Amino acid sequence: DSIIVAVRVRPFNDREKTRNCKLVIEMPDEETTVIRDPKTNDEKRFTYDHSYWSHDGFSEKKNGYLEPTDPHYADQRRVFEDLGRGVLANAWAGYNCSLFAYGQTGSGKSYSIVGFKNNKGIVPIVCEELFKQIADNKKKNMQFEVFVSMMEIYCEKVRDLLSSTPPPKGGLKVREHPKNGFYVENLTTVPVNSFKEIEAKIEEGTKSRTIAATQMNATSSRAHTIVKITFNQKSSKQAGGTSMKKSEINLVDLAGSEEGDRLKEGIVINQSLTTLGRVIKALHDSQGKKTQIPYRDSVLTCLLKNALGGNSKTIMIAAISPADINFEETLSTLRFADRAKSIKTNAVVNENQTERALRELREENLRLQSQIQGGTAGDASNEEIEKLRRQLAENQKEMEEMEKSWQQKIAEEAAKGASEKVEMEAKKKKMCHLWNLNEDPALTNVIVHFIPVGESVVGNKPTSSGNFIQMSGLSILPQHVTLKNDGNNQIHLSPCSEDLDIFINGKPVHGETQLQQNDRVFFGGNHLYVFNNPTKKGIRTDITYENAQAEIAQNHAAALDLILEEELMSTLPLVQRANAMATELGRNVKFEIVLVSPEMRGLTSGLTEIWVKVHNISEDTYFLWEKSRFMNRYYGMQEMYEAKQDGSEDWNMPKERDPFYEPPDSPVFIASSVVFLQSLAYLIDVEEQFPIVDLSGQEIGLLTVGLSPCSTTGKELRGEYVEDPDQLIGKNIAFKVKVISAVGLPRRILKSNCKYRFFGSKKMTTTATVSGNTPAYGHEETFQFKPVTKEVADYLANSNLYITFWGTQRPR
Ligand SMILES: Nc1ncnc2c1ncn2[C@@H]1O[C@H](COP(=O)(O)OP(=O)(O)O)[C@@H](O)[C@H]1O
Ligand SMILES: [Mg+2]
């Protein structure tokens, strides 16, 4: 009784196609997946229960559904008929099931699980078929109960997506029922009678998820989302008194499966994924002395302990991208699904007599009551005598629900408000409104802010006054912007500060600006919206987060080709969130994207480097991070921001642990120098000054370097006259470079050295470190060449040495 692993390949999206990406994934049969290395053509061949090819051979119908043209395209209905049929059979049989999707952010976890628009995924049609199969097949005298729950797991904190109650500190409690396993205490479980009910419930759950993602940066790529459906079949008038069969389905959308500082990256964010990699590994290595599987090292592996080798039927969807750039991550995915493929689970039917279940629950209630008796009269650990009362209250609620009829349950739950959504969708046709625009496509156009017909103010102030639109969360000020609506005919947006970075259509805004139909407004952090006036023109709702960020990156690059644009599309939003998090967490640090062009490196064609300039205003220190280092320490920043939002006592943390601080004696790339080697091409011995430029491109100093030819012996060659540098070809000539001295270095620098790599040496030459701001490096190194090659001659005659400066600013 083993797991069911299935991999699925999404098609090329609209930005990978213009990027000219080669397909690196092939599926021969409906079982095998072949990943071929782009630069090596080496193939790795994996086998699974299903290899879903959703890349070729489909056609978008007028309804939007992607129907397969050839018999190889895995449409939504095929993935359903293979896995949702299985989860429905498990639910009807009495086995509790668990389907989870692993994969990279963008590979298609959310598409496979939930779906997107008219291509519905596992959850919707599984719910629909469950309710239909209830209403159709099962006769005799039986009752059927369907309960839905929905939780998010973020930084090891469990948050109830179906509860408007403000969340506790540290998230909801996770306790281990001794017979049933790990569970979430005080998790909302509503009874649903029709498919519309569970649809609206999951809808408001995704609404809460969207609010968390946009206001507190609870990013979907860094969080897990679980939908828990309990299906109960109650049978009466049997040989025994009465019985109930029970199934618990867990549909899990996992987080994205995607140095100088250990503790300043993520530890709590990736934890549930990290140990998920461990557990699987630990479960695969078991194949001859016992090992230990670390379920308790994270919340996810706790809540999926039965799914990962216990009492459950487990299904896995590994979504992979068919592109060159992701070849590594894809492979990792394919390897993860390969390791989990060897997982045997022991699922049993959950039938229990109603009277004996009630009696067991009551005896546990009595055990807890006696525990609190021993509390008040004995040890009375005020920490423990609250945990015990929590458990007693949960048992009490369970007993109260057992006695209750399902009709009374649905009546009580319907007694507790849905007209808010009806009238919201209604007044969206009459009132001007900004709708959400989120990096997770499954959360775009979910929340909405309505613009009153007067002059209102957007800000992070909990209302309590007139003419106020409340935006709460990251980057939003108590008085952010001012909106002026003229009878839903002419709306003007004006920022309340000159130091407030807000954008419209990507172009920055400095004064009163009139909004127009389908404008793309950005307030800060994650507050990216699209304006809609329902009275004028023709509205639009098919605007993706990728379009707005694309135009923002276009305008930013024009201020300061598609490879660079698509990379700013990944870096810029993170830099916005980094600045907002820094200024909110008390860290007086400012991040700004500095890009190094090929021309700045002495090249003609080439990739443009992206750096994140880091200014620590306190201590007044400057740094410069590679984009990757910024990504890792941004993971750290996001973790710290969540720690603050939870109200923890350990968010403001020491220097060695917070991701915003960088020690001052840390070296930083400060200056650039382009030394043209033409002097070597003509075998002349000269030493001149070359401009030193900071990363703004501004020339700030002069670097005297020495250029001279010398024989392979080491002596000064022989005095010929080179008129064309090809005369050097075939001769044994060496060239020494003498980084003599520099002037004009920044006054803040106290130690510096130079770095370069001569032609074909694969040994990064780095000079000694010198004190003053006018340092005498005194470096020298000859570069031998057995035949001076036409490539080397062209190098000397037309290219240049790219010397970079690395310095420190404060003491040691
Ligand atoms: N199998 C697929 N078929 C068609 N489109 C897909 C598929 N998988 C993903 N996509 C597209 O890729 C985009 C991002 O996928 P998403 O569901 O966000 O994956 P993840 O949540 O794992 O990042 C979606 O907008 C969707 O339209
Ligand atoms: Mg997702």
Residue numbers in the entry: 5 to 262, 270 to 298, 303 to 431, 435 to 578, 590 to 841
Authors' account:
In this study, we determine the full-length structure of the kinesin-3 motor KLP-6 (kinesin-like protein 6 in Caenorhabditis elegans for intraflagellar transport in cilia and mitochondrial transport in neurons) in a compact self-folded state. The structure was determined by the molecular replacement method (using the structures of the MD and the FHA and MBS domains of KIF13B as the searching models) and refined to 3.2 Å. In the structure of KLP-6, the extreme N-terminus, a stretch of the C-terminal tail and several internal loops could not be resolved due to their poor electron density maps, and the structure comprises residues from 5 to 842 with the missing of several flexible loops (as indicated by dashed lines in Fig. 1c). In contrast, none of the coiled-coil segments form a canonical coiled-coil dimer, but instead the NC and CC2 adopt a single helical structure and CC1 is melted into three short helices (CC1a to CC1c). Unexpectedly, from the overall view of the structure, all the coiled-coil segments and domains of KLP-6 fold back to successively wrap around the MD to form a self-folded compact monomer, consistent with the monomeric state in solution. Finally, in this compact structure, the NL is docked onto the MD, and ADP and Mg2+ are in the nucleotide-binding pocket of the MD (based on their well-resolved electron density maps). CC1 is melted into several short helices that associate with the NC and MD to inhibit the entire neck domain, while CC2 binds to both the FHA and MBS domains and integrates with the newly identified MATH domain in the tail region to form a supramodule. In addition to contacting with Switch I of the MD, the signature residue D458 from this β1-β2 loop (referred to as the D-loop) makes the electrostatic interactions with Mg2+, together with the phosphate group of ADP and a serine from the P-loop of the MD, to stably chelate this ion in the nucleotide-binding pocket.
